[PDB]
Design a protein around this nucleic acid. Structure first.
Ligand SMILES: [Zn+2]
Lengths: 233, 43, 12
DNA sequence: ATCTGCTTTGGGTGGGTGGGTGGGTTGAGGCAATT
DNA sequence: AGCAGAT
């Protein structure tokens, strides 16, 4: 009725239903795939409701929408100092004070390519930040090779933002300098919190390699951590 | 995919014989025709 | 003594 | 598929016709404004 | 030494 898409889900409700105990544990252990199947199930049930109830509401509009779920309260919140390597790719809860937030970063979803001898364009999706650019036009008539250019302003982009978080005063054991962890928020969670706010963030504790230099492919053995946020309160 | 490119969902499809192939992408996580299309296109 | 290939705009 | 060739880290064994919104950050000394 | 190019 309101036209929104995001569904705020509470974890405990999964433990309330006999069927979904294993689903709850899997969410806590494999958040990415579980969230994906949750999103698709939400979209499928949304379309099925209209299909079964033969309502007058337009179906094309529903088919156009990306649907999402935002789990929260997934267990006792841990501490930034207690994040060990055992938690990499696992859902965690962090309570901390915002400290800064960078401007919106354009993150690429779909690349757009155009030929220089036939003016034929086709959009190729992206997987983990790599463009599968073609070696020749998909047109049979013009099969010229290595004649693809990237039209930067015709691609598709998504909203990304990097926030810095610092722990609450009560979590400091002695009074030393509080530590800092970096976050990443995408889509409707962008600009969801202002500097100096006390927020509780639920996300996946991820880790990414760092390149040694901007020329070669050598990576430092030390991995840098961050949090991929899915819900903010 | 609704989520961003770096979300990182991995798949394991089972062939008629007991071998498992690996595919990446939420659409693959949901569908099988998309999985086979990606398998063909990744060649 | 040249191997030249031609492209046409009408094909666009 | 093999052979040929340039350039780092960061730093003065590249520089100041590349600059300081590309990083290398304390110490001293001169000048205007504040007193 | 890794990667960018010509035969
Ligand atoms: Zn072409």
């Amino acid at each position: 009725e309101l036209g929104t898409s995001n569904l705020n889900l509470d974890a405990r409700n999964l433990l309330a239903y006999k069927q979904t105990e294993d689903l709850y544990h899997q969410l806590l252990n494999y958040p990415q795939e579980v969230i994906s199947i949750m999103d698709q199930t939400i979209k499928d049930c949304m379309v099925s409701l209209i299909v079964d109830n033969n309502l007058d509401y337009d179906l094309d509009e529903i088919e156009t929408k990306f649907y999402k779920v935002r789990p929260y309260n997934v267990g006792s919140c841990k501490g930034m100092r207690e994040l060990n390597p055992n938690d990499i790719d696992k859902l965690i809860n962090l309570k901390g004070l915002v400290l800064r937030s960078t401007p919106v970063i354009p993150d690429m979803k779909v690349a757009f390519f155009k030929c220089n001898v036939c003016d034929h364009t086709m959009a190729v999706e992206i997987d983990r930040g790599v463009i599968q650019e073609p070696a020749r036009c998909e047109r049979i008539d013009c099969n010229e090779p290595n004649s693809m250019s990237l039209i930067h302003n015709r691609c598709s982009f998504a909203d990304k933002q990097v926030i810095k978080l610092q722990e609450t005063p009560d979590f400091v054991p002695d009074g030393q300098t509080p530590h800092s962890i970096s976050l990443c928020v995408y889509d409707e969670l962008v600009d969801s919190c202002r500097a100096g706010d006390r927020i509780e963030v639920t996300g996946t504790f991820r880790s990414i390699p760092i390149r040694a230099n901007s020329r070669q492919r050598v990576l430092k053995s030390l991995y840098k951590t961050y949090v991929d946020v899915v819900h903010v309160k | 995919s609704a989520r961003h490119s770096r979300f990182g969902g991995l798949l394991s499809i089972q062939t008629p014989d007991k071998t498992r192939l690996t595919v990446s992408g939420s659409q693959a996580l949901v569908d099988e025709k998309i999985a086979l299309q990606k398998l063909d296109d990744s060649k | 003594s040249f191997k030249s290939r031609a492209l046409n705009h009408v094909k666009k």
